[PDB]
């Protein structure tokens, strides 16, 4: 259950309260991440703009 926030600031382990990891960025270099924290609901997208939710592994 440990996760990072944006890149360059990490967040550790963020379990119990919490339930998944997420990212949040656009189109940049060549499809990078650009935030990143834990929380429970994080559905819907856009099109230029993605923001996806991890559960477990390679992401809290």
Do not use: E, H, Q, W
């Not at 926030?5 to 270099?29: D, R």
């Not at 609901?41 to 592994?57: H, I």
């Amino acid at each position: 259950l440990k996760c990072n926030k944006l890149v360059p600031l990490f967040y550790k382990t963020c379990p119990a309260g919490k339930n998944l990891c997420y990212k949040m960025f656009m189109v940049s270099n060549l499809t990078v991440p650009v935030k990143r924290g834990c929380i429970d609901v994080c559905p819907k997208n856009s099109a230029l703009v993605k923001y996806v939710c991890c559960n477990t592994d390679r992401c809290n």
